[PDB]
Every structure is written in structure tokens, then in C-alpha cells.
Amino acid sequence: NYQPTPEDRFTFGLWTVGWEGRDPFGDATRTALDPVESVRRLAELGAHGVTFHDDDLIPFGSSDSERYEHVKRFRQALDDTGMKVPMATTNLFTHPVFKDGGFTANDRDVRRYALRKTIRNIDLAVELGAETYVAWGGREGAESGGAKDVRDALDRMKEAFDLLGEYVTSQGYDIRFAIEPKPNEPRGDILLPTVGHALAFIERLERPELYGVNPEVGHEQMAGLNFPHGIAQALWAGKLFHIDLNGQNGIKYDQDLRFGAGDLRAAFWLVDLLESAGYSGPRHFDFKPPRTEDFDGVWASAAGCMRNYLILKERAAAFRADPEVQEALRASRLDELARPTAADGLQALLDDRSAFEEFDVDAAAARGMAFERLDQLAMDHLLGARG
Amino acid sequence: NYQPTPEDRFTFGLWTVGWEGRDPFGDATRTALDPVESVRRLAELGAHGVTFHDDDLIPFGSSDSERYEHVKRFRQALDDTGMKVPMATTNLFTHPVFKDGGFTANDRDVRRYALRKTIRNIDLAVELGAETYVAWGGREGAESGGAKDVRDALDRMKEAFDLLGEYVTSQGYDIRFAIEPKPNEPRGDILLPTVGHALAFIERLERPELYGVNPEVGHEQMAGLNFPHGIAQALWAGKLFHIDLNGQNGIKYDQDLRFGAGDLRAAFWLVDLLESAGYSGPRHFDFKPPRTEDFDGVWASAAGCMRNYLILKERAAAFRADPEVQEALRASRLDELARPTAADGLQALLDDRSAFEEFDVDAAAARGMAFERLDQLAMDHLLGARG
Amino acid sequence: NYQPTPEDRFTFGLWTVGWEGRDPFGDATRTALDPVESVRRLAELGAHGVTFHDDDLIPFGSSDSERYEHVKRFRQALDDTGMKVPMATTNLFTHPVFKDGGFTANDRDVRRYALRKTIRNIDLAVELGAETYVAWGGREGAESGGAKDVRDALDRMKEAFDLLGEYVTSQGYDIRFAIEPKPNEPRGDILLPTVGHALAFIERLERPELYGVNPEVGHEQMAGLNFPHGIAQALWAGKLFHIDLNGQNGIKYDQDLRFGAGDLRAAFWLVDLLESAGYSGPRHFDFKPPRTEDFDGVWASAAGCMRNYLILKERAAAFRADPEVQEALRASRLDELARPTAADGLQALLDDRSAFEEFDVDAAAARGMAFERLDQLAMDHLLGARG
Amino acid sequence: NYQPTPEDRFTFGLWTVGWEGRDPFGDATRTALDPVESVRRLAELGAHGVTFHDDDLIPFGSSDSERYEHVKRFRQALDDTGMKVPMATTNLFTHPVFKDGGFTANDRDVRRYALRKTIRNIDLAVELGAETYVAWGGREGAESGGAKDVRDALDRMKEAFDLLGEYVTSQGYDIRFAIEPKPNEPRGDILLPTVGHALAFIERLERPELYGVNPEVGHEQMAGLNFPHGIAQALWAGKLFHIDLNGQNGIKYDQDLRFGAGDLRAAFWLVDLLESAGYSGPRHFDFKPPRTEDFDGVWASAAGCMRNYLILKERAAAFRADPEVQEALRASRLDELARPTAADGLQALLDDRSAFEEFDVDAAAARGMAFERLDQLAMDHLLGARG
């Protein structure tokens, strides 16, 4: 049951189903997949589109001619399937030249090169119809304290993003940027480690309106944070431009499990939030089919990502629509949380004896919040065991 | 050796040395300390001042008269010792009425009460000469997903802070606010969990200039984050209004060990940064002498906080002043990180063939960063084993 | 639906539903519950029995007479309800005298007192029909390195347990001991921090057969470990004497959420294992209804513990019984994992050219494990969305 | 200063200084090092010996002849330098055939192959004079619950180790086994995740005396555990056969930093313990020079490992030898922890009224442990700022 269609806006990076299985302790377990084949297979599964890093599509070092050809072949597969490309990004982490970062490398020549490599890909992304350009600064950071002066590094990071905003403005492109935070791995500590740090940083750029965040489930969970709470803050700020979905089992290396695996209750609350807030961007999967799998397992893993999202969507919708749940929400005062604390204004509050002098603290303290009953209704709904 | 003086600006909360030792699994191991006695003992140790929550100074429920008296006695001890009160805060977490929060409690009546209790203490803080008013929303959060709609909660949090800014503006007080983030404990997840989340939030307030952050070593470490990196971002934003120092051994409950305990290398890099950036606010200790200790152990623990800061200050200064270290910093290109990537401008960068077309990636990739030698010089300096 | 009965063997500690809500940052939110009332309420919910620490039942310091009376009243409630007492334990953590431990306190006089307090409660436990006596050494550990020589502490821990084994042997009691590991909280680091450390320790006692483990979901998760894997090792060793069920959201303070909350997929795999291995001891809940709740919320939370176990039991049973799942298990070679690697013996293996000289490594390497399809079948079963 | 000599017993794996820098997100940053060159360079730095995985020395797939040659060349470098080979191990993790494990792979044919590959290397290890054979089952584990029945897997693990013990017994070799635990990475959860789990497992083998543990600093820290406490338990059991030293900054991916980096205070307490207990095996470094470094940085990193150990050794020795520290140890009752709790026996304890009936709990409770003063003396000693 639960079959996805392109209207569900499910997207996948070419590097997800294309991951060959090389890990820090082992060789590849699968042969390389041609991007054309991945587009075809994903389309068959009901995906809406694909995403790419420049180097996933055009082998690093390719001549302008080989480049052409890679693009032409890719475009033909998109035309043949109806698949879209809503987002693109730059690989500023694989090649040895980026060992100390791209935008924040200590070497100035590298920083310049990083910007040129990025701008080249922005042109390509626009050509392919992408509306979001993601930046994951996976090598921006350090393993030791004296290696990076963080204030200088943020000055460099701001400079790079401001230059990119100037470029898109000048070309008149309709494309926005999304910064993807990650707390660590591959660097000991990565700069702008969480959604909060990325949101704060954006506020210091020259044209903040061009930038948002691209949070990833597993990344925030690597810091032990509540992913749905972080997404709520991004939505509250009007900055959720894109989202990366996957699963992670706690604080450890980035597992990139299929969506729904990892913390299942957090997946439920995330879907509840995306659907309630009416998020309309792509539902992108940045995951890796385990290296234990063959190609059949790759497609099964990708299909499971979409299936899990649809099952959760159904259960969250049934939860919110259940009259008994609506009643429990009022019992727990969720309605009162939505009302202004003092629309009456400061003076009125200062003059209100019921707010202090005559406030019965003990009576208020004795009121139960009834959160456990509400949470068991949510559990019953998730498990399909009532409501 | 390493003796502190009031000029070192070391401050302590009354609740630190005054902690009786009650933990989630045990009764108090020490009798209550009179605030007057704590002021006297701290002054003797060389501290510069003390801080307080309203309820530490005036027992919750006190009549206006008893209140007077508590204040008069406290003021006399400050006058007798020369101790200052640079910061004050509100207890919106102990009393049962705050079980679901203060500013973000689902019950509107509680939210109003929370604001009135806070405003009352702001007046007192100003009277005592405090320049910073801290807000730690330790009960703002949840243990389950449906109990708190985070967007509504942030609307409530913004409303509360905006009202406080309106109050101080209207009274013409010279006092600024500092938000103290914490990821969890006592709530399952706390709102504005890290310095990044707090910085981002401040940017949406009506008068952002009145608010900064009051980060705490152990709090960011409870999320596995790099404390010195977070402080660098706060300084970069011009928002480090105050700082709380302590020690924590990784991701676990908030230990509140004395400063220098926990992650010693992180303590070194933090002191290096505070001293290099010329931070001039109080060096405040929010720690708890372990419940294994008697009063002698309390004073020994407090003294150790200051001693460790002074030892680290000396070692960081010797590190930065060592010619061999200055040379290693240039070998690692820290000087180049401080130079603009493209002061020449966007067009110039686009036209620069040395930045892309003729950039020798392999030659750049082959350059070692020499970070290990630099980090061993930092280790030798910390340990007093050379440079 | 999913209604528990005494035959389900669900048990609760008096301190679980009796928790008043005092946390490290706040006062109690609920009045004390009389043990008699808790027995009655639990019986009504369908529980099978209750457990207790000596101090939960008899207020610390009680005269022999008051003690009698507390016991008589308790016994009458058990008789009136049919509730049993399968396990009992000692409180060697609340009173200030245990600030540095019970069995491993540096002070010898305290260690002697700890043993006497424990032996007194063993007699009571036997009288009430308990078959398991649990030991949670929550204060055995340290906050700093020089405070505890761990080898001396383990010698003391071994001495205490050997003396307890000698006591029960000598009295001819039929009661076994279960050690409950916890990695930290309230001490900075607790001795025998995980199920593995406790299992290893037992092997050095004088009569290892009298001791097993009493693992707790949240405790192993506080170390980021796989709870079901740890329980499998305890079962493999024949040492799972009892089990404590609750929920925990990752590495942070011990949350003690109701069972099913926290890591739901881990709860599923744990039930699958307990039910498949035919574990027949009590299903004990060591949890705390959140301090946000009133008495109605306490009973709702306790009921949810049992409900979640029964729902998971049903889903795990449907998973194992599904023919499609049985087929997937064979596709993934779970049947081959159960077969001896070399029942043929060492020489035969050494002489087997198919095991090395003629083994086709590439062909074996190319075989997919089909684990993703199997895991999606498990997800579908948990969610009630097929199989 | 602090110069190592072969008498310090410092050893390094060929794969440590030989790590090319490939990580999950990037290509190699350094060319391959010939083992002969690494032996020569390490000897120059003052190391005592090297260790190897079969595949580090003989390229996987090598003919018996090429194998000979690799060994002959290696032996000549050992002869030319005086370097020893105290430990050897098997690579049962890199090749795709081991994607689901070696000893616990679901496929029986793989398990047989894993044993044959291991036995072949045991013969070589003995030939080279190794006294310890390490087993790190990095691929033994799972990413999902149904993929591995843990009881069957432990039966397979026990079978493999018993067969290896039978082999060495039968050949009359003088070599012991050491199991190296790791909680996760590369598998989602690894079997025998901590030193405790490995110690417990050994007790179920047929000849437990042939097996011990080879704990690694960073591995236990990836579970948030106290490394020195775990080593104390291994020593207490008489099972510390070897030890792997490195640095790790908390719960995250395995960083493999040089020893002394990471948690410096834990490094201090570990050296204090190894030196006090008189551990006489190799001080082995299993670390990776960061990929930011060139060959000069590799040698600087390796040298720093040894330097840090020697500096810590000096500071721990000065701490233990300081009369003021000896006095503080008695003030904290470390002497009393070393005395039997009840050498008088059980009956005597039962009859001792001073142990219960007349024990003054309040007086005992009021005694401070004086641990903070002791810990500040340890800090002063580590920092070279007194005692």
C-alpha cells in the first residue's frame, strides 16, 4: 500500500543510491552506477527528482567537452522520465586540496579556487532548473585549537557567502542558498554546527533574504538535539528552504540510515510538523543503503524511505483529526499556549493584581498538565492501536 | 602562587558555594549558608563579586518587610567587603508553579506571573548595581512531542522578552539581558538549546541590541559541542555579555564541576580566546562543590576555580608570546586566514585565471598544514614542558 | 484494547508511581502516596506485584515497633489484592552517610553499616516472598581520579557480595542477587557501568551461581549501547535474573520515561527477544511519571507502560509468524548463522581447500545480505502497515 | 627534553603512520609508505617495535612467493634497526567479503575463510616473535535488529575463539590472544562493545587463560566511559594483555588523535595507573596523523605520542611521591579503602553493635571526604604549578 507519486515531491541525491560502500575501514562493495540509470530507477519508484554535487555528475578534471556530454546525457534522462532537479550543491570536501576547508581554508589560493568551483556549478544548477543551491561546509573546522582562529574563519565564511549573493544578484538568477549544518565528521568540530548556529550566521550576511537552512535529521541528532524542535525554530524564522531526511541512532558517526530507521518517534513528530506547517519544498533523502546490500537492496532501501514518510503522514493526520486528541490538546492547554500572554500591554500587566499580588500560586501549581495521556494517544495513533 | 584579586573580576553565584548537596537521588549533605557569610568568605578568597536569583536572597513568599530586611543585611555585607553584584537573575524553575515553564508555560496565568516575578527582580538588580540580567529558561521545553507547539512557544518567548525590553526602556535603566542556553535537564529538551539557537532568536526581538548570550561551559559540552568555537561565534556577533565557567566530563547530566576540571584542553583554549579578544566582563563561576565535601571542601573548590583560570591565563600568554609558536602559526598559514579572500572584488576573481583555469590543485593539495607540530607546542606550553 | 492481567507479570516499584517530582532544580509537585494506596491502585490497573527499597516501606530511623506496623499494614494490602512482591532492594544512596558509597565508601565504618542495613532487608524480603534481591550501587564511584583506587574498590565490592552470599547460604534462603549497572548519575562515573562490566565481575565472586544482572533500558542507553544486544549477552550467559523497563531519549540524564517512550524500535526488538527466549521473570517498570502530572497522570503513565509492552508483544509475534518474514530470514542467512562454523573440527577445517585455497572470495563478496528488505518488513509489522 | 628509548616499550602499528588519509568523505592526502621505511623512521624516533595486520605487510591476494619476499624485506629492516614485533593481528574488515563480519558473518563459508586467514597469520606472527595476537571484530555487529540473532552470533564467536585456542595449544605456540572491544563504527553496533563485555565473554571460552583484552582509549570514550576505571577492572581481573593509546574528544566518530590529545586529565590518570600497577607490556599507539598533514607532520605526530606519555609519567610520579599528596590521600581515607571491610567474618559483623545498633550515622555523614583539595593537588602536579 502507501505508494508514492511525483506529487509527493520525494527527491534523492545521485550520491545516495550511488554510494559504493567505501567506509573508513573498508573497500567498495558495489560497482559505480551511471547517473542515467539512477534517474531511470528512481523515476520507476515514484520519485519526483534528483539532486547532485558537481563532481557526482561531471568527473573532477573533465574537459569542457566531456563536461558537455555528461550534461547532455543527463538532460536526456530527465526528459525521458519527467524527473526534475530542484537542488544542486558543490563538492568542496573530497579532493585533497580541500583538506583544510573550501571557504575557510587557511590558504587564500584554495579559498579563491573554492569560490570559482562553486560559481561554475551555480550556472549549471540554474540551467537545469534548480531553485535551491545547498552549501555543506564539511571540511570547514579543525581537529586542534590553534589551527583555526574562528572569528577570522567566520569573516572568511561571510565573505564567501556575500560574494555568492553578489554573483546571483548580478546574473539575475532566481535561486536561493541553503546552509547545511553538521556538528562534526569529517572534521573534529565543524563550523556552524547546528541549525541555530547557521540561522544566527545568516543574520550577519549582506542580503540575509537569499539564505536559509537545509537541516538534516542525522546531523542534529549527532549533537543529541531534538530535530523537530530545530525545524520548528527554522520555520518560525521563515528559513526552512529545504530539508534532508534520513535516520540516525544517537550520538555516533553519521549513519545515514533510510528515513524512518533511527528514532522513529522523532520521525513521526517531524512529519506531523512538516505537514501541519504546510512545508512545500522537496522531501529530500540524503541516506546511504548499507554496504551489506546488493543493487536489489539499494532500491528496497530507497523505496522504504518514501514508504515510511507516507505511513507517518497518514498516522500524524489521523492523530490531529481525532476528536479525542483535540479534546486532550485542550485539556493540556495547547490552545492557551497559542494566545498572547499580554495583548493588554505592559502597563495593564503591571497593574493586574491577578497576575501577582492575588495570584494563587498553589492552585495553579496543583493543576496537572495531562501530557502523559496525550502522549499515549500519540503512541496509539503511531502504532495503529486506536486513539 | 597564582593569587586572585578583585581586579581579576571573578564572581560566584550565591547558589554555587551555597548548594546543600541535594541531588535526584539524595538528601542535602550540608547546612544552608547565610548569604552574608558567603559574601564574607568569597571576599576573603579574592573574589570580585557575587550574583543571585531573587529566591536565593529573599525566601519565596517573604512579606515586603522581611524582603527589606534581607536586602538591608545583604547590602551591609557588600559595603563591609567591597564586593559588587554585576549580574542578577530570576528563579523561574524551582517552585511547582513553573513545572511547565515560566515564559512558555501552556497556562497563560503562569506566563503573566512569571513576567511579574521577573520585573520585580529587575528593579532590585538595578538598585544593587547589576549591569547584566540573565534569563535561564530551564523549564521551557518538554518531555513529549505533543505537549508544546514550538512555534507558539517561541512566539510566547519573544513576547516575554519584548515586554522586558519595553519595561527597561521605559524606566530608563542601564541593564542588558543575557539568555543562557542549555540543551536539556531538567526538561527532556529545552528551547534555545545552544548558543547558536539563542543568537538566532535574539535577531527576531524588537530591540536586539538589548540582548546577548550568557553561555556556560558545561551546557554546550552536554551537546558535545566545542565551547571555545561557540564563544568565538558569540564574540564575532558582538553578543558575549557574560560567561559562566565550570567543568563537565562529556555528554551526561550537568556536573557543574569546578572550572579547570572536565575538559582541560578546552579550558585552555577558552582562556586563550577570552584573553586574546579582550573580553572584559565578569569571569563568573556557576559550579557546585561536590556533595562529598564539607565547608572546608566548599572553599577549596571555589579557590580552585580561580587558581585554574590564572594558571591557564599564564600558559596561554606564554604560548602566544613564544617566537617559535609565532613562527609555527605562520607555517600553518593562520596569517593567511586573516586576509580577505577577494578584496579585489567579484569581477576580478571571475577574471583571475590563477584562481581556476591555471590553479595547480595538486601542488596546493601537497602542502602540509603543519597543525600537529603547532598543537604539540600548545601541549608543551599547557604542561609547562617547553615551547 | 490490550488489557493486562496479573498473568502478564507486570510489576512496579513503590518509588515509581510514588515519585513526588523533586528534581535537581525543583521542589516536589505531588504529595506522598501511602504504599497501601499504591498497591490498591496498581492491582486495579492489572499489575501482578510491587517492589520496594527498605526505606520506601519503613521510613529511615523507624523503631522496631513502627517497623512492625508498616509491615503489617503492607501485608494486609497484599492479602486484600492478591499482589505479590517478587523483588526487593536496599536504599544505599539517599542518606548523607552514603555520599561516597555503601559497599565501596572509603570509610570502613560506613561499609560495615551498609552491609548490616542490607542484611536486615534481605530477611524482610524473604519474609514477603521475594525471589530476587537487587543491588544498585548508585553511590559507588567518583567525580575525580584520585578519590577512588578502583582495584581496591572492586576488592571491597567483591568482599561485600561474598559476605551476602555467605549470609543467604547460611540461612538457607532461596533468593538470588541481581546487580543493576548504571554508567553515571549520581556519581560522575559509577563502578560496574554496563551489563558487560557486571557480568565480568560476577565471575570473580566466590559463588557466581547466586548472582545475575538486573539491566535497565535507560541505563545502557545512557552509554549509547544497544539494549537488546546487551540483554542477548546476559541471556547467553544465563544471567538475566530480572529486568527493568523504561524509556530514555539518548545520552543525557536518566529520564525514566514510561516504557515504549524513548527509543521505540529498541523497545520492539527487546520485546521480540524476551518473548522469543522465553524469559519468565517479572516485567518490572522502574520509571517516573513526569513532574508535570497530577495523580490522574500518574495512573495514566503506569497504565501506558503495560499497554506498550502488550502492543509490542503482539507486533513482534505477528512479525515472527509471517511466512514472508520467515522467507526473508532465510534470504538473509539467519539460518546459517545458527549452524556451527566447523562441527567437522579443526583438522578438517585446516584440510578443507574450499575454506581457503579454493574459496571464491569475489563471488561470496557479491552476495547481498538483503537486510534492508527484512528491516522494512519489521517496520511494516511494528506500524501495523502489512508484512 | 623527554626523549624516548626502546626501553620505554613504545610501539606503533604500520597502519598508523602509514594511514594515507582516506576518510568517509575524502580521498587520500598522502602516498603509501613502504613498511621498511616506516620501521626505519620509527626506530630513529626511539620506538621499540611495530605491529601489523596481515594485509598491511602482505598485499591481499599475494602469491606464496611475493609473500616470502615481503617477509624477507621486512625481517631485514627489523634486523638492521633492532626493532621488535610484539603483537600482530588479522584484517577481517577491509575486503568486501567481510561486509557482514568474519567470525560472525551470517554466511558459514565466510566464517570458515575468516578462521583460515587468521590461522595463517598466527603462524607468521609466531615466526616474527609476537607474544600477543589481537582480534578486533570491527565487522561483527549490525545496523538493524533482525539481521543478527546475538545469541547465535556469540555461539559463533565462542566457536571461533575456541578453535584458535585449540590451534595454538596443538602447535605448542607461546602466544596469547587479546580481544579489542569497540562500541560502534563501522557497524551500527559492534558485538562485545566495551572492556566489560569482552571480559565477561572470555569467561565462557574453553581455555579462558589464553585470552585477555586489548582496550583502546578512544573506543571506551566513544561510549562515554571512564577509560582508567575500565583498565583498573581489566587489571583487577588479570587480563590486561596489551593496551592501545590514542586521544578522542568525546562521543563521536573514532578520531584516533595522537596520545595526550583528547581528554588530557584521563590520559594523566591512565599513566598514573599503568605506572603504579607495574604494567609491563607494550605502550602501543593506534592513532592516525590527521589528513591535513604531510610526512613531516606524520613524524611529528608519532613523536608527540611518546613525548606526551613521558611528560605524564613524570607528573604522575611527582604527584604520588609528594608528601603533601600522601597526607591528602590519608585525609580522604584512601588507606581505609584498602583495608578489608570485615576480615573479622560474617558472624562477628552481625554481632557488632557498632556496625548498626550503635553506629552514629549523623557523625559519619558530617565527615567531609576532602576530595576537592586532593583533586586540585593533582591538577597542580599535572600543570607543573606546585603540589
UniProtKB/Swiss-Prot annotation, chains A, B, C, D:
Q: Which domain of life is it from?
A: Bacteria
UniProt signal peptide: none
Locate the active site: 53, 56
Subcellular location as annotated: Cytoplasm
**So what does this one do?**
Involved in D-xylose catabolism.
Name the coenzymes or cofactors required. Mg(2+)
Name the protein family. Belongs to the xylose isomerase family.
Q: Which GO terms describe its biological process?
A: D-xylose metabolic process
* Encoding gene (name): xylA
Its Enzyme Commission number?
A: 5.3.1.5
Positions binding Mg(2+) 1 in this chain are 180, 216, 244, 286
Q: What name does the UniProt record give this protein?
A: Xylose isomerase
* GO CC annotation: cytoplasm
